[PDB]
Design a protein around this ligand. Structure first.
Ligand SMILES: [Ca+2]
Length: 298
């Protein structure tokens, strides 16, 4: 039984995922934007977590653990400042926030696929510190288990190697929202494409997470991506654009890469749909809609 909340246009279900436009949150883990992280799923199906290795900028990390907060430092002695389960006791870490999504998914069989933007704020560790790309994949896999849909799954769907998604996606359809019912898609962002390139080089076709580089030219979609190796560029199936770079969403769309645009809150959802944006990130997500919908086909 496919879910039927009013904000989903039912035409979405038989549309390839790359042909669907969504209202997404921007930084909805912050208390100012929602009372609980779980509540965000009352309004949208694309969420975001900002995650840190250390308790402040320089200290306090532990293996196989990351903190969730906006700023390099917080007055909360826990190193967490967010609306996930544990908010009020300091136990509201990345794993807790991921578990909020997992638990919501278990309670809503047949849900529209959930996309989580994981906005990484520090560099990767080496093996001894327990926060490598492999450790990150192990965490997300432990939490979500078989809920995940990964780059290799997409590559199989389109008949490509995962390291040739970049160009082989052009002209192809992702699975439909119906095909993806009950699934979770994880996306890695960082201000520096080098950290995405480090992730992809480490994980290759085993990656649990889609990389989505900062995009401000054609080459960041289909060429040697700024800040990345050739190898890492080939795994790109998603692209991340700030407001000033949103014209590139039309080329993400052309390449069947999932484009996200953030920072463009004064522009309507309907306008963003005309601009071929898959994921339009809004701080005030519940206030956005087009003809009553927050998810609809282009
Ligand atoms: Ca963010």
């Amino acid at each position: 039984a496919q879910e039927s909340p009013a904000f989903i246009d039912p035409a979405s279900w038989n549309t390839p995922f790359n042909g669907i436009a969504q209202v997404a949150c921007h930084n909805c883990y912050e208390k100012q934007y929602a009372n609980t992280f779980s509540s965000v799923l009352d309004s949208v199906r694309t969420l975001e977590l900002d995650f840190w290795d250390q308790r402040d900028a320089v200290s306090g990390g532990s293996p196989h653990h990351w903190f969730v907060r906006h700023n390099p430092g917080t007055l909360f002695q826990s190193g967490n400042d967010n609306n996930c389960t544990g908010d009020g006791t300091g136990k509201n870490d990345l794993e807790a926030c991921l578990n909020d999504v997992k638990n919501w998914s278990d309670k809503h069989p047949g849900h529209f696929p959930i996309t989580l933007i994981l906005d990484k704020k520090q560099g990767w560790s080496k093996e001894s510190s327990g926060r490598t790309p492999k450790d990150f994949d192990e965490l997300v896999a432990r939490v979500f288990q078989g809920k995940l849909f990964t780059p290799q799954d997409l590559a199989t769907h389109i008949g490509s190697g995962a390291g040739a998604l970049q160009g082989n996606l052009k002209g192809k359809s992702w699975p439909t929202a119906n095909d993806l019912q009950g699934k979770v898609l994880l996306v890695l962002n960082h201000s520096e494409n080098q950290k995405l390139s480090q992730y992809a080089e480490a994980r290759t076709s085993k990656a649990k997470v889609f990389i989505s580089p900062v995009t401000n030219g054609q080459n960041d979609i289909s060429g040697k991506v700024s800040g990345m190796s050739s190898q890492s560029s080939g795994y790109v199936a998603m692209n991340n654009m700030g407001k000033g770079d949103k014209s590139w969403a039309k080329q993400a769309f052309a390449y069947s890469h999932i484009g996200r645009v953030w920072g463009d809150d004064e522009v309507s959802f309907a306008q963003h749909i005309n601009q071929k944006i898959n994921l339009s990130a809004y701080y005030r997500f519940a206030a956005q809609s087009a003809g009553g919908y927050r998810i609809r086909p282009f």
